[PDB]
């Protein structure tokens, strides 16, 4: 066995089409279901509809609602526990309401003979004029004593005579006819000694603190069902975590024995088609802000570095079927796009507007929208551009034009008759297929300094850079590759415009030297790149401030030191072994050592002489 899990429902009193339709989807949701992650809602079910699939239901996480049913029996015969992680209304984790119709018929049999715990929340019973036996149920065994005060029990039978509880039953309390429907008391029937549940009336049959409905024995693994989490039928306070502080390594480390959390369960791998959040919980799919990927046959959400990948149809396809260009109407549909599947056309019509297709002039400002675009699958076509804009500013993050589709079967990048001065395409590192044509841009400089053949993937691709401002003129006006650029060319005047630096680079920018020995963030170099020193190394006066990335490669620790790592503070209340939280103090040399195991709340010195009371 490995319990079947269904989603649950939260439609409350809403009715999904015909009674007929409603039941079909109820059945569809719960058929075979053992554990309900969400709520169980049984609603609008009529006379003579077989509801027997409900016999499979062992556990509900949310609430249980049973309302507006005329069906005779609701055989929730194995429901052991309602956690009440959500409430129906106010604060009821179980609500059984107006189960009757105008036709003088309603619900008779709700035999929940195995319902032993409601973990949180109260219960409402009202307007069930055909209900039997339940009114005899002694709720103090089922409901936590904090919720007794919000209990709403109104039992009134006016539609039948009922069967009677077996004399076998305790205090005449039962769920329906027969010995098998007697309440099984597991709380109110037990000696002082026991904290929680029980299975006998003696001192030596208390249930472990950890159990919910009752138990089959003393030990933590004999529970019927778990108050908090279960981990292969051992009830625990929490799922064993993914990271533990490593006393040897002096930091967080993969806890080998660690486990993800799924429902009220601790599990080594999420069920098929589930993703693990950055907190160790199995969820159905990743939050925006983050994305799906994989390390060790485990799908996880990592958080997006910059805008999340988003794919959009180009002009021509989809929302943009029959569109001549990006334009006032359509441009909004581009917000946040990262990759364009298809082509972009920016044409004069965009800026005049077009009374024929009912489109107003495009606010050129709005082209800022394209800044998120990193990939064009087809071709980029720019035949118009705001004249007071110096370069192709909206495409500063374009990394690749794949040129799968091409204008007239030819061009993958076409820039024609603009007022620009530089291309500005500083991120473009690949044009997969197609030809470049840059023509009639009378102020355009820089274009020739690029070796276009390096962006190309196919050896037949051609360039045509014609009738722009001449090499001669640009040179004569200083509009030429910055000093800090290698002989590999420009996309414009600025140092972040170069294809590659003659010396070193920060991020995208070219520089003459890194900040070794002087500077705001002190740095080291690798592959002509200036990488920052970890923020916990002290800026040194005389020599370098670090040799690499870690908190291990400081010359000198800015604050405290923990093994080989410099840290901002000593570890204080990090989760450790055996579920022993971990506390360190900083000595004279500002070096971290363990506190006395006994200092529940951290310490300032060694031993009990370090955490006064």
């Amino acid at each position: 066995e490995e319990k079947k899990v269904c989603q649950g429902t939260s439609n409350k009193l809403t009715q999904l089409g015909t009674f007929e339709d409603h039941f079909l989807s109820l059945q569809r949701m719960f058929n075979n279901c053992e554990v309900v992650l969400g709520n169980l809602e049984i609603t609008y079910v009529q006379r003579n509809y077989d509801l027997s699939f409900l016999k499979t239901i062992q556990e509900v996480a949310g609430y249980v609602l049973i309302a507006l049913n005329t069906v005779e029996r609701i055989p929730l015969e194995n429901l052991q526990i309602i956690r009440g992680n959500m409430y129906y209304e106010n604060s009821y984790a179980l609500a059984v309401l107006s189960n009757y119709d105008a036709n003088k018929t309603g619900l008779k049999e709700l035999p929940m003979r195995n319902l032993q715990e409601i973990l949180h929340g109260a219960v409402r019973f009202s307007n069930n004029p055909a209900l039997c036996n339940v009114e005899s149920i002694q709720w103090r065994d089922i409901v936590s004593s904090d919720f007794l005060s919000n209990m709403s029990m109104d039992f009134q039978n006016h539609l039948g005579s009922c069967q009677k509880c077996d004399p076998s039953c305790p205090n005449g309390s039962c769920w329906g006819a027969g010995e098998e429907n007697c309440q099984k008391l597991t709380k109110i029937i037990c000696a002082q000694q026991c904290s929680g549940r029980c299975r006998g009336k003696s001192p030596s049959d208390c249930c472990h603190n950890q159990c919910a409905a009752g138990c089959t024995g003393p030990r933590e693994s004999d529970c019927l069902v778990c108050r908090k989490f279960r981990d292969e039928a051992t009830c625990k306070d929490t799922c064993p975590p993914l990271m533990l502080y490593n006393p040897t390594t002096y930091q967080m480390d993969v806890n080998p024995e660690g486990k993800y959390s799924f429902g009220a369960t601790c599990v080594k791998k999420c069920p098929r088609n589930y993703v693990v959040t950055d907190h160790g919980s199995c969820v159905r799919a990743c939050g925006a802000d983050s994305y799906e990927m994989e390390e060790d046959g485990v799908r996880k959400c990592k958080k997006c570095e910059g805008p999340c990948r988003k794919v959009c149809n180009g002009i021509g396809i989809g929302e943009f079927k029959d569109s001549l260009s990006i334009n006032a109407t359509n441009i909004k549909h581009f917000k946040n796009c990262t990759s364009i599947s298809g082509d972009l056309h920016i044409l004069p019509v965009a800026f005049r507007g077009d009374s024929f297709t009912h489109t107003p002039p495009l606010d050129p400002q709005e082209l800022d929208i394209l800044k998120t675009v990193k990939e064009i699958t087809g071709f980029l076509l720019i035949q118009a551009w705001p004249e007071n804009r110096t370069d192709l500013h909206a495409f500063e993050n374009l990394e690749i034009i794949r040129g799968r589709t091409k204008q007239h079967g030819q061009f993958s990048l076409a820039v024609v008759s603009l007022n620009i001065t530089s291309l500005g395409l500083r991120s473009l590192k690949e044009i997969s297929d197609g030809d470049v044509i840059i023509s009639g841009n009378k102020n355009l400089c820089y274009a020739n300094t690029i070796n276009w053949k390096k962006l190309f993937g196919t050896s037949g691709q051609k360039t045509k850079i014609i009738s722009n401002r001449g090499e001669n003129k640009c040179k004569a006006t200083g509009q030429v590759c910055h000093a800090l650029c290698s002989p590999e060319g420009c996309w414009g005047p600025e140092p972040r415009d170069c294809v590659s630096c003659r010396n070193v680079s920060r991020g995208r920018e070219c520089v003459d030297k890194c900040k070794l020995l002087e500077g705001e963030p002190r740095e080291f170099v690798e592959n002509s790149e200036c990488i920052q020193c970890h923020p916990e190394c002290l800026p040194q006066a005389m020599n370098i401030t670090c040799t690499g990335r870690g908190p291990d490669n400081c010359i000198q620790c800015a604050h405290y030191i923990d093994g080989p790592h410099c840290v901002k503070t000593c570890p204080a209340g990090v989760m450790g072994e055996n579920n022993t939280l971990v506390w360190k103090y900083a000595d004279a040399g500002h070096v971290c050592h363990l506190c006395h195991p006994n200092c529940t709340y951290g310490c300032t010195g060694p031993g009990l002489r370090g955490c006064p009371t």
Epitope: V349, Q383, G440, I466, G470, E471, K473
Partner: antibody
Framework: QVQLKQSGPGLVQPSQSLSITCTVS????????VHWVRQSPGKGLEWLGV???????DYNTPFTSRLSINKDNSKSQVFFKMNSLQSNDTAIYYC?????????????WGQGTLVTVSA | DILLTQSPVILSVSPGERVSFSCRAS??????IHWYQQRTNGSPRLLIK???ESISGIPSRFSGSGSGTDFTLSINSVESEDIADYYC?????????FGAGTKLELKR
């Protein structure tokens, strides 16, 4: 068969305007710009401007302030207008279309209009 | 501004000889040069694009060569309908620009 054909009254009074129509066939103005080039004995062949396929124009510096080129794609017609002519402006005026999108290798030319600027 | 200087003003050749026309750009310009033929009363006619690239419809006895500042249109066995003006054009600097023309004349 790419063809360009010009019509337009060619004798023009000084300060009056010159208008020439260029009716085009065998390709659409949807896909190709039409250029305008003039020729005289004295100062040679000279490029005047373009209405590019998308409808935007571009004029050589000396005609910036007085050239006007328009088009009607559906009738495949281009309309050159130039204001305030003087005798500098006597020439044979031509429309042209490049062999190749966005280029200036002019494979096709109207028959030219002989324009004479006198009062 | 880019200057295009064609020379000679009149080229005088015997019919059948290999004749060559020269165009000199004042700034080095790759291969961004085209050539036209213009017959009396005719509109110009494209012969070579990008310095050396044949144009279809043009007889094979027309070739072109050059790169930078120095370009050359050539005719092997000059015919009598090769009597025309020949022009070069540049493609590199806004605006396109033409040379002044060489007149081809047949000796006799």
């Amino acid at each position: 068969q790419v063809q360009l054909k010009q019509s337009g009254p060619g004798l023009v009074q000084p300060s009056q305007s010159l208008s020439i129509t260029c009716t085009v066939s065998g390709f659409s103005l949807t896909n190709y710009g039409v250029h305008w080039v003039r020729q005289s004995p004295g100062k040679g062949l000279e490029w005047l401007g373009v209405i590019w396929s998308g409808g935007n124009t571009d004029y050589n510096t000396p005609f910036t302030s007085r050239l006007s080129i328009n088009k009607d794609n559906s009738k495949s017609q281009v309309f050159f207008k130039m204001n305030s002519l003087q005798s500098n402006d006597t020439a044979i005026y031509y429309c042209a279309r490049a062999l190749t999108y966005y280029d200036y290798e002019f494979a096709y030319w109207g028959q030219g209009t002989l324009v004479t600027v006198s009062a | 501004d880019i200057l295009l200087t064609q020379s000679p003003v009149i080229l005088s050749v015997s019919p059948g000889e290999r004749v060559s026309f020269s165009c000199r750009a004042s700034q080095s310009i790759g291969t961004n040069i085209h050539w036209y033929q213009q017959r009396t009363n005719g509109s110009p006619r494209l012969l070579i694009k990008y310095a050396s690239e044949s144009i279809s419809g043009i007889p094979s006895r027309f070739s072109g060569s050059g790169s930078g500042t120095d370009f050359t249109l050539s005719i092997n066995s000059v015919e009598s309908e090769d009597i025309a003006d020949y022009y070069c054009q540049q493609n590199n600097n806004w605006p396109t620009t033409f040379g002044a023309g060489t007149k081809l004349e047949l000796k006799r």
